[PDB]
């Protein structure tokens, strides 16, 4: 295997019919990271739903494995997964409409794959609450023009007095947005590392992906290496071949420039016109929807 097989035109997950929410999440979660690999390896039990086995086998052998070895997956495979999803949650547009990654993850991880909650959170000595991701929510006016994800997490946690019951191995954070026409911050600095030490009643995590969207189309950024420059951008529908009977062509491109913007301070990014942000880095800083964090495997010290 290697990196060179994952990079280029006709690479990644092939989009088809408003599927970018699915293609980009999968890409974020499985293209390079291994934090949720157990989810694909866990044997069928009594408690598991009817579609479990074939869901897991489709996800493992027709999607993740071909992605990792060939760098490409057909939209037909994704379409089979969307069909299962629609079998579980009917009349919700799983085969037709662009939806929220949150809903995809909930159906897949709660209903079909009997998946242990990734987050256990305690609010002010209450009993813990289970979820797969965390939503940043607070008021802006006092705060800085371009915050880091660190700061957002802190402020959101304090705003509702939360703590981790135990340290997560996979932390998916949703950025503070309110529909298409509203972003709390024009730019947000995605911290490469998260110190959660002061958020556990009683220590580190690393950023491996960022799921972005401007208004309706999801795209992905992925950190494949500890190197500053080790970033990829993925787009399930970067090009099209044919017309109505035609089809989409996904692309995975390298965006080292990202590593350079994340060496700068937020105050430097703020004083910088988004039109002067080179390459795909603009989309990262401006269109971030989910930051995904994992227990450090890529780095040293």
């Amino acid at each position: 295997m290697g990196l060179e097989v994952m990079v280029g035109k006709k690479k990644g997950i092939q989009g088809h019919y408003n599927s970018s929410y699915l293609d980009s999440t999968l890409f974020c979660l499985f293209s390079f990271s291994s934090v949720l690999d157990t989810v694909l390896l866990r044997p069928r039990s009594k408690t598991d739903v009817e579609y479990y086995k074939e869901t897991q086998e489709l996800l493992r052998t027709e999607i993740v494995n071909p992605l990792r070895i060939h760098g490409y997956v057909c939209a037909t495979k994704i379409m089979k997964l969307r069909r299962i999803l629609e079998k579980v949650e009917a009349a919700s547009g799983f085969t037709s409409e662009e939806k929220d990654p949150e809903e995809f993850l909930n159906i897949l991880f709660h209903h079909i794959l009997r998946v242990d909650p990734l987050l256990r959170l305690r609010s002010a000595g209450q009993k813990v609450q289970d979820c797969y991701f965390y939503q940043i929510f607070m008021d802006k006016k006092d705060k800085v023009m371009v915050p880091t994800s660190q700061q957002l997490l802190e402020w959101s946690f304090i705003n509702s007095d939360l703590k981790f019951a135990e340290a997560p191995s996979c932390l998916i954070i949703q950025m503070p947005r309110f529909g298409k026409d509203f972003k709390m911050f024009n730019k947000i600095f995605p911290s490469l590392e998260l110190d959660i030490t002061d958020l556990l009643d009683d220590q580190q995590m690393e950023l491996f992906a960022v799921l972005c969207i401007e208004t309706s189309h999801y795209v992905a950024f992925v950190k494949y290496g500890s190197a500053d420059s080790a970033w990829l951008f993925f787009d399930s529908m970067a090009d099209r071949d044919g017309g109505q009977n035609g089809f989409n062509i996904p692309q995975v491109s390298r965006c080292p420039e990202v590593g350079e913007y994340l060496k700068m301070t937020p105050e430097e990014l703020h004083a910088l016109d988004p039109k002067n942000i080179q390459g795909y880095a603009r989309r990262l800083l401006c269109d971030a929807y989910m930051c995904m964090y994992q227990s450090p495997t890529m780095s040293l010290y």
Partner: protein, 148 residues
């Protein structure tokens, strides 16, 4: 009774419920008061997303309590716009978008001034006042751009 729904925008809607009411019924009340469709709505209480098949009493929700609301990013689609050379540009749009703001989007992504753009779909030049839906332009359909 009286609860408070708090939005990221900063607005704090005040609502009249009964402790055994469904999260569904509420989203309908919120739609009446803010126009936001229920399928876009996400109720969150104490960092916990509230499911619609459940009731309020079970989330420990009593009067004067405050839930959070944020919106899902749903609908809309991508279309492809090709020049005569073959160069492709992708665009995030909605069916209700007019051709005018589509041209605006082309300028935000590529720099090209809107009144220098000629859009064609199915052989028809596209008029600024009309929407993509009016030209029956669906997901992943391709428009052509020529420069005057």
């Amino acid at each position: 009774m009286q609860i408070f729904v708090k939005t990221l925008t900063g607005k704090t809607i005040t609502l009249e419920v009964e402790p055994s009411d469904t999260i569904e019924n509420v989203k309908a009340k919120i739609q009446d008061k803010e126009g936001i469709p229920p399928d876009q709505q996400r109720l969150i209480f104490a960092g916990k997303q509230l499911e619609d098949g459940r009731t309020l009493s079970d989330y420990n929700i009593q009067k004067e309590s405050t839930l959070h609301l944020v919106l899902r990013l749903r609908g809309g689609m991508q279309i492809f716009v090709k020049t005569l050379t073959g160069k492709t540009i992708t665009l995030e749009v909605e069916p209700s978008d007019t051709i005018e703001n589509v041209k605006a989007k082309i300028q935000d992504k590529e720099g090209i001034p809107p009144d220098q753009q000629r859009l064609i779909f199915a052989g028809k030049q596209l008029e600024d006042g009309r929407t993509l839906s009016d030209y029956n332009i669906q997901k992943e359909s391709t428009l052509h751009l020529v420069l005057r």
